[model samples]
Target: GSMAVNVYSTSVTSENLSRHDMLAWVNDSLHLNYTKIEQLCSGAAYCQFMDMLFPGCVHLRKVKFQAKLEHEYIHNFKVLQAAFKKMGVDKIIPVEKLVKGKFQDNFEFIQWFKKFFDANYDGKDYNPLLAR
Candidate 1:
């Protein structure tokens, strides 16, 4: 029998990635900075970041529009789940605790999303296309 795990599209390692490496990649590849990314804690910011990262993603565009119109903090787990499903990424286990509104802000939610990918990554036999 064989099993496969797909990681994010970027070249982030399965092991812990230092802030230096992350920052460098974000700057060089994504053309963004860590400080700018750190300040993106609101729904609109997160949505824009996702839109830029994954161009032509319809779900992300919808989320972006929703985030811009909404004032209160929106728990975006459902939206993220929908995006993941559309991306055909079902292997990543759901983080139940995090899903239960653990994130008070969009920044925290984004951070958890990154952590989720790191937690599930298996470099040996993983799909890079889905990892992005």
Candidate 2:
């Protein structure tokens, strides 16, 4: 008995590829750790993690994961900002100021937030806004 299998050859380019798919490709090609990569992204450090992991991959570099990270960051930022405001911490910078700051996009905003938050929140027992 013979079985017929259809095989199609396709190519993946950064122009139309997704970060998840790209990560999977790199994992398969380089025997890298996909789980770690995902963990990094989930931890809100996707950009830095990718840079450290694939410093020499042109395809990875060309594919901007910043927009996705930026969207995630902005959503979280709004949520946290509202919570902070409700808690009477009016010192939180306005969105307009954040936009006008050194950050070029949400990705940069997130990166800065991670650093700033970690530094300020590290020894704190708890965050009032995060109480909920």
Candidate 3:
């Protein structure tokens, strides 16, 4: 089967995606990047992704990029957790699932995230580099 015909709808389900589109959507939205699903585990990308959508909803310093160690990853997710709370997002992010996660944890949540982003994104331009 082909991908779901609509890419921009907030109502799209996770099951509708082709996986390829998740990579493409994240990469384009992240801007100037080669994003891997595994790399997303750091949660740095997500903080900015969340920030870009809400603009000033997140304080960017606590969450920086290229996070290598587990605590480093943990800190970013903590910041990510706060951002979602501030933004009134419904999902409770399991920082535990991500930091010690199976691949399923990060990818599934990220796929759902893209759907949320599509749902609410305002189409304002974001400078992810400057935001960081």
lDDT of 2 by residue, 1-132 (tens): 111111112322123234465456445433446542332232223322222322321123223323345445444345445433433333343454343223244333343433333323323232212211
TM-score against native, each model: 0.39, 0.25, 0.82
lDDT of 3 by residue, 1-132 (tens): 111122333564556465676777778888745455667788888888877777777779888587788889899998988877777666767788887645788887777777777766779898776865
lDDT of 1 at 39: 32
Q: Please list the C-alpha lDDT of all candidates, in the order they appear.
A: 0.40, 0.34, 0.73
In model 2, the worst 10-residue window by lDDT is 1-10
TM-score of 3: 0.82
Tell me the spans in candidate 2 whose CA falls farther than 4 Å from its real position: 1-69, 96-132
List model 1 lDDT by residue over 46-122, tens digit each. 33333343433325434433332123224344455555555555534333543233334323445444544454434
Best by TM-score: 3
